[PDB]
Amino acid sequence: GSHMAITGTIAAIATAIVPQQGSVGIVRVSGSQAIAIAQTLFDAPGKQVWESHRILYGYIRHPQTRQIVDEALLLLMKAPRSYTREDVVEFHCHGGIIAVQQVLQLCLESGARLAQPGEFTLRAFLNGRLDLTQAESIADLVGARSPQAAQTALAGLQGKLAHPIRQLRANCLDILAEIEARIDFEEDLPPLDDEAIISDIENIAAEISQLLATKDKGELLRTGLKVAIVGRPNVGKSSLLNAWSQSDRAIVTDLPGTTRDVVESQLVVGGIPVQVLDQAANTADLVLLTIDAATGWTTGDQEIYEQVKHRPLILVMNKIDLVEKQLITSLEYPENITQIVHTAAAQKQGIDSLETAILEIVQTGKVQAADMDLAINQRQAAALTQAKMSLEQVQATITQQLPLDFWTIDLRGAIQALGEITGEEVTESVLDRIFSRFCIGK
Amino acid sequence: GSHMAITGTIAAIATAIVPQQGSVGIVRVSGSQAIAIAQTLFDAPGKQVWESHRILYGYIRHPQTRQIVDEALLLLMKAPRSYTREDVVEFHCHGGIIAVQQVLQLCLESGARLAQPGEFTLRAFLNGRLDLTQAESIADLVGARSPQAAQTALAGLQGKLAHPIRQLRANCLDILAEIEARIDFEEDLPPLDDEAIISDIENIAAEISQLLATKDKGELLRTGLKVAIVGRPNVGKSSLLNAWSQSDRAIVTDLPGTTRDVVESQLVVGGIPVQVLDQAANTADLVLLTIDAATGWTTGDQEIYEQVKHRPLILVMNKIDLVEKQLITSLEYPENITQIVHTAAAQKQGIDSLETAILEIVQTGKVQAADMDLAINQRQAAALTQAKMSLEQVQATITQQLPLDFWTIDLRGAIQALGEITGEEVTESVLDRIFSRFCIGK
Ligand SMILES: Nc1nc(=O)c2c([nH]1)NC[C@@H](CNc1ccc(C(=O)N[C@@H](CCC(=O)O)C(=O)O)cc1)N2C=O
Ligand SMILES: Nc1nc(=O)c2c([nH]1)NC[C@@H](CNc1ccc(C(=O)N[C@@H](CCC(=O)O)C(=O)O)cc1)N2C=O
Ligand SMILES: Nc1nc2c(ncn2[C@@H]2O[C@H](COP(=O)(O)OP(=O)(O)O)[C@@H](O)[C@H]2O)c(=O)[nH]1
Ligand SMILES: Nc1nc2c(ncn2[C@@H]2O[C@H](COP(=O)(O)OP(=O)(O)O)[C@@H](O)[C@H]2O)c(=O)[nH]1
Ligand SMILES: [Zn+2]
Ligand SMILES: [Zn+2]
Ligand SMILES: [Zn+2]
Ligand SMILES: [Zn+2]
């Protein structure tokens, strides 16, 4: 019953862990029992100094014996100078699938409880090292699948999003203290400037409208695009992948945990993470239909076009190295298509045009409303519009000139809604949900 | 052309890395350029001390700009007090699939070269911090898929295997200096005790024979068993897995990188890692044939038995909760089977008997010749027998009583063969092959 209050000492595995990959694996412990557990588990030879921000060498051993568990490194982060602001220790094990398990188990046995998803980064927020926008954005950092998705996440982490919103809430709180002091103290204050505070709302709701503009970029860099490739057999679907993948793959270096099929399908086009799925995919945001220009449009092309035409579509005209130049514009295709691209897959050319076509079909809303790499998410934008509505709800009731009693209801609503975002005023259901979608160890 | 000589400064990703899992990911740099690269890349606020074994907080930034790449922790390991004995730095990034890539790239740009498989742990050996048996066993540690496979690997790491072999090589070198001084200095030394040194060989070849006994345990804990489950549809194959898996799974806690299907199939029986494959599997060491005791043996049972009978086989008689007690011994099955087990899969009982049957079918050679958790591998055992052969080759030529000239050839061979194991005398082809089967970052 009810988190929001730090009571125990928590431990979890802090790194990805796969059976025969990766040199090292961490186990992180945080809480008032942290150093006590490192104390009773880590054997550090030849009197090394046990201070904060000090690396130690030794052996994690006794499970009630002295039976050595790993040759490990110990990290100490004491004081409020840690991730969670609590005392933090880290065991740096070899870690296949065995050592970390063994060490974690020894932690639970020494009075640590198993941390829940996001619980480390919650305790960070709970001790006022982070606000919600920051907490949220570190999940965005490790969740990023493109260089600019990270850039956007890093901006969130850095506080670039927490600073404006907390600034705006202060403003509403200030023009709330003005109205609330007049309503209570007889004279002792000259009357309100009825149209100066319609100009203050016009300032605030303007800034929060600039933020709500980024919302689209946010959804794209976070979720990315789900792209299906359809076509007939021997048209060049697999050939299309290779060409596109080689110049657009998200993984350019060999990466221990990840399997080649995710390295192959997870790529990036003009900043947007693009994920290639494997007539079936209505789960796709955009579909690439591939026909063979060497034989031109066929009946098999028509039918699978009939299945996918309701979804955003790009016709990929493959094997143009086989048609001669003068006859390219002569090639037949159903007239409703507005996005056609000629590619020579085996020759690895055309993917530059494919990119332009994919970016084009996306920038019909506003992908050219982008300013910098700061972008809010769904939940943040949800609370911002609701703060905007409630804010111009007051922007109406002061032109009607009701008494100060019927101004204060809606202003509070705006302050509370902005309080949701940074987290000075959040329901615990909202709070639990935020951290529940974090992975374990985070 | 030719490793075996440290020239550059190397960098690689030291942890497993999967797209949306694991709180942190390391990038390790080692060499004379290590600290210089941390210098020019890690922004550490408010003058923190830059000493060895010190944890630093800050921001990995400029790619020729100042553009922040991650909020990271820096680890410094200077002097010969490191993994590789060189100067070692570690960047501890957030790491999804983006941050570590970004940081590694910035390392290559600052004069680091990308480390090759095992190259860190080779440089450790190359600077005499480890012998080959130890180097080999750290790959065994992260490669282990059972608690005792780790225990065995840790023994190797600890030096429990390097100590005896280097001891034995010294002995051969000593009884080589005795013979070689007599052959060269006129008198100046009383003649050899011809049957004292047949007793010395009887001591050495005895100890190296005790080691060669473990070879079997070694192969089992390293490779483990590949077990296939065959049967007809609706017999209880999937039901068998669950029951067996729940009390024998190798992963008892939630582990970021690994997928449920590897958590499900990778289990352990009496110490041996057992991997469950998915009429087809001759790639299996042991097969479990499952029939349905409720309907008894069928014709479909017979045919798939005809496919798998040449492989070691255990008949799993499933659904015994449906046959009544007196009629169990009455159930018909082909007479050549010597290993039958009754299981009630849905009721989760029988897996204790299955274990006993699986251990039984394996301990026909010598799995009860085991003493402790020290066990040599294929390559080590290969060089040991060859040292043994060459050692009793001398154990013959001194009973024939040839001159001291025709003793020295074979003794050297034994010393050289034992020199292969710890690594004081290795071909570079052997050396390259050893580290080539390590994963990257290791
Ligand atoms: N090994 C490792 N463990 C982790 O828990 C971890 C990494 N690496 N890499 C990134 C880091 C997240 N970043 C942080 C954030 C704050 C502090 C910290 O000590 N708190 C102080 C700063 C110290 C100072 O100013 O001197 C603070 O008050 O913010 C440390 C690391 N992180 C988690 O993913
Ligand atoms: N973060 C991290 N990085 C690593 O490279 C690493 C881990 N963890 N965990 C286990 C460790 C392998 N173990 C070692 C071995 C030797 C030293 C070392 O500093 N060498 C000295 C010991 C220092 C002393 O005696 O005070 C030596 O001479 O052996 C450090 C870690 N290892 C890699 O997988
Ligand atoms: N000339 C030419 N041949 C191609 C091109 N793309 C694919 N092919 C050939 O067409 C065959 C079928 O391609 P494939 O990728 O397997 O099509 P899929 O079955 O839809 O995956 C392959 O043998 C390729 O060599 C192209 O752009 N030009
Ligand atoms: N009474 C009984 N029923 C079982 C047992 N094992 C499996 N079943 C039932 O038999 C059905 C088929 O089992 P299943 O695991 O799917 O067999 P598979 O098709 O070979 O994978 C399931 O619906 C189970 O409920 C058992 O030990 N006892
Ligand atoms: Zn194909
Ligand atoms: Zn036509
Ligand atoms: Zn089945
Ligand atoms: Zn019969």
Author numbering:
A (entry chain A), B (entry chain A): -2 to 275, 296 to 459
Give sentences from the paper.
MnmE is an evolutionary conserved G protein found in bacteria, fungi, and humans, which together with the protein GidA catalyzes the formation of a carboxymethylaminomethyl-group (cmnm) at the 5 position of the wobble uridine (U34) of tRNAs reading 2-fold degenerated codons ending with A or G, i.e., tRNAArg(UCU), tRNAGln(UUG), tRNAGlu(UUC), tRNALeu(UAA), and tRNALys(UUU). The crystal structure of MnmE from Thermotoga maritima reveals a three-domain protein consisting of an N-terminal tetrahydrofolate-binding domain, a central helical domain, and a canonical Ras-like G domain inserted into the helical domain. On the basis of the common feature that the G domain cycle is regulated by homodimerization, MnmE has been categorized as G protein activated by nucleotide-dependent dimerization (GAD), together with the signal recognition particle (SRP) and its receptor (SR), the regulator of Ni insertion into hydrogenases HypB, the dynamins, the human guanylate binding protein hGBP1, the chloroplast import receptors Toc33/34, the septins, and the Roc-COR tandem found to be mutated in Parkinson disease. The X-ray structures show MnmE to be a constitutive homodimer where the highly mobile G domains face each other in various orientations but are not in close contact as suggested by the GDP-AlFx structure of the isolated domains.
NoMnmE crystals with sufficient diffraction were obtained in a PEG 550 monomethyl ether (MME) condition. CtMnmE·GDP and NoMnmE·GDP (grown in presence of AlFx) crystallized in the space groups I4(1)22 and P4(3)2(1)2, respectively, each with one full length protomer in the asymmetric unit. In both cases homodimers are formed via crystallographic symmetry by means of the N-terminal domains. Strikingly, two molecules of 5-formyl-tetrahydrofolate (5-F-THF) were identified in the structure of NoMnmE·GDP, which were apparently copurified from the bacterial expression system. This suggests a high affinity for 5-F-THF and supports the recently proposed enzymatic mechanism whereby the C1 group of the cmnm modification is donated by THF. In NoMnmE·GDP, two Zn2+ atoms from the crystallisation condition, localized by their anomalous signal, are coordinated to the G domain. One of these is coordinated to helix Gα4 and is involved in crystal contacts (see below), the other occupies the usual Mg2+-binding site at the β-phosphate of GDP. As Switch I is resolved, but does not contact the bound GDP and since there is no indication for a physiological role of Zn2+, we consider this to be a crystallographic artefact also observed in the nucleotide binding pockets of other small G proteins. In NoMnmE·GDP a Zn2+-ion tightly links the G domain to symmetry mates, while in CtMnmE·GDP the G domains fix each other by a toothing upside-down arrangement.
